[PDB]
Amino acid sequence: VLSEGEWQLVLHVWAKVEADVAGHGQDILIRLFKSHPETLEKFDRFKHLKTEAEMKASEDLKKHGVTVLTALGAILKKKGHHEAELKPLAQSHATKHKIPIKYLEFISEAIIHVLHSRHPGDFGADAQGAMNKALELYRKDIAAKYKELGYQG
Numbered sequence: 001v002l003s004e005g006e007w008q009l010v011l012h013v014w015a016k017v018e019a020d021v022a023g024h025g026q027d028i029l030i031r032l033f034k035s036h037p038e039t040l041e042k043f044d045r046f047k048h049l050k051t052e053a054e055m056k057a058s059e060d061l062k063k064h065g066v067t068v069l070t071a072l073g074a075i076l077k078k079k080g081h082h083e084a085e086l087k088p089l090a091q092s093h094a095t096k097h098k099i100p101i102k103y104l105e106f107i108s109e110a111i112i113h114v115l116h117s118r119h120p121g122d123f124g125a126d127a128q129g130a131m132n133k134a135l136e137l138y139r140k141d142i143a144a145k146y147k148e149l150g151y152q153g
């Protein structure tokens with residue numbers, strides 16, 4: 001359970017992310033695809049993009065990044081009261097997209113890395129630690145849902 005102070009730090013850096021949701025979404029997905037190339041193989045509409053510039057020029061990819069961050073922002077804003085928001089995401093990611101928890105750890109790392117690259121002054125150890133706790137909590141919840149649905153990825 002995050003503290004109120006921890007949530008405030010998370011929401012404070014998240015407000016900076018919201019000044020350019022598209023750019024942050026691009027960078028996060030690009031980082032994910034570059035740090036962990038097998039993850040690209042789960043996106044059949046992007047798996048042909050080969051260079052960082054091609055990835056940045058993809059409007060489809062850019063739109064998807066906004067969709068991802070928008071869902072995640074909505075969950076973060078619930079400050080731990082997120083079952084109704086998170087459960088549909090768990091269901092699709094288990095049933096349709098087939099995304100193992102280890103890939104959720106990869107994109108969590110990509111989030112941290114981007115927020116730290118763009119907002120160092122608002123993403124010190126304190127805020128990093130809070131955001132890591134939030135994402136950890138979502139990964140724990142998603143996993144219980146995955147199992148309820150019979151998905152052992």
Ligand code: HEM
Pocket residue numbers: 039040042043044045064067068069071072088089092093097099103104107
């Ligand atoms: C913070 C973590 C994540 C969030 C918040 C998130 C959110 C979303 C959302 C909202 C959608 C559109 C609705 C849906 O299909 O459920 C989506 C689609 C998708 N997600 Fe995720 N996702 C996350 C992590 C992952 C990861 C790690 C992968 C793959 C490694 C993945 C693969 C996909 C795929 C393939 C789609 C469908 C893409 C499309 O064809 O438009 N997601 N995701």
